């Protein structure tokens, strides 16, 4: 069973840092294995069409 994605920590458009987290989070549904959303608002979800390609985000420490 493949592990869920990780939402890396980021800073939002209001300048606030959000810590990263492994998907699904403890009180997420078990199918919420994808880091979804936008670079400024990342969250675990189950829908491939909502996946965030985090490698392209600029507002995190990642390559």
Short mmCIF file of C-alpha atoms in Angstrom, two decimals:
data_model
loop_
_atom_site.label_atom_id
_atom_site.label_comp_id
_atom_site.label_asym_id
_atom_site.label_seq_id
_atom_site.Cartn_x
_atom_site.Cartn_y
_atom_site.Cartn_z
CA UNK A 1 0.00 0.00 0.00
CA UNK A 2 1.51 3.22 -1.18
CA UNK A 3 1.91 5.92 1.48
CA UNK A 4 0.01 9.13 1.28
CA UNK A 5 1.47 12.36 0.00
CA UNK A 6 3.03 14.98 2.26
CA UNK A 7 1.93 18.61 2.17
CA UNK A 8 5.13 20.59 2.69
CA UNK A 9 5.15 23.63 4.93
CA UNK A 10 4.46 26.95 3.27
CA UNK A 11 3.78 30.63 3.75
CA UNK A 12 0.41 31.93 2.63
CA UNK A 13 -0.46 35.19 0.87
CA UNK A 14 -1.09 36.86 4.24
CA UNK A 15 2.45 36.01 5.31
CA UNK A 16 1.54 33.19 7.67
CA UNK A 17 3.52 29.98 7.91
CA UNK A 18 1.69 26.65 7.92
CA UNK A 19 3.51 23.54 9.10
CA UNK A 20 3.62 20.58 6.74
CA UNK A 21 1.75 17.35 7.34
CA UNK A 22 1.44 13.80 6.18
CA UNK A 23 -1.78 12.81 4.39
CA UNK A 24 -4.28 11.70 5.46
CA UNK A 25 -4.17 13.65 8.67
CA UNK A 26 -5.42 11.83 11.77
CA UNK A 27 -9.01 13.08 11.43
CA UNK A 28 -9.14 13.11 7.65
CA UNK A 29 -10.96 10.40 5.74
CA UNK A 30 -8.69 7.49 4.90
CA UNK A 31 -8.92 8.22 1.14
CA UNK A 32 -7.58 11.78 1.58
CA UNK A 33 -4.11 10.69 0.52
CA UNK A 34 -3.28 13.52 -1.93
CA UNK A 35 -1.83 16.96 -1.11
CA UNK A 36 -4.50 19.10 -2.76
CA UNK A 37 -5.25 22.77 -3.23
CA UNK A 38 -3.15 25.74 -4.14
CA UNK A 39 0.37 26.78 -3.20
CA UNK A 40 -1.13 29.12 -0.57
CA UNK A 41 -3.70 26.65 0.79
CA UNK A 42 -2.71 22.99 0.89
CA UNK A 43 -4.88 20.24 2.38
CA UNK A 44 -5.31 16.47 2.11
CA UNK A 45 -7.96 15.26 -0.28
CA UNK A 46 -9.06 12.28 -2.38
CA UNK A 47 -9.52 13.91 -5.80
CA UNK A 48 -6.79 13.69 -8.40
CA UNK A 49 -8.12 16.80 -10.17
CA UNK A 50 -7.43 18.86 -7.04
CA UNK A 51 -3.83 17.67 -6.61
CA UNK A 52 -1.23 20.31 -5.96
CA UNK A 53 2.02 19.92 -7.91
CA UNK A 54 4.07 21.22 -5.02
CA UNK A 55 7.37 21.14 -6.83
CA UNK A 56 6.33 24.22 -8.73
CA UNK A 57 5.34 26.31 -5.74
CA UNK A 58 7.60 29.20 -4.84
CA UNK A 59 6.35 29.78 -1.30
CA UNK A 60 8.12 26.88 0.36
CA UNK A 61 11.67 25.73 0.90
CA UNK A 62 11.58 23.03 -1.71
CA UNK A 63 13.57 22.63 -4.89
#
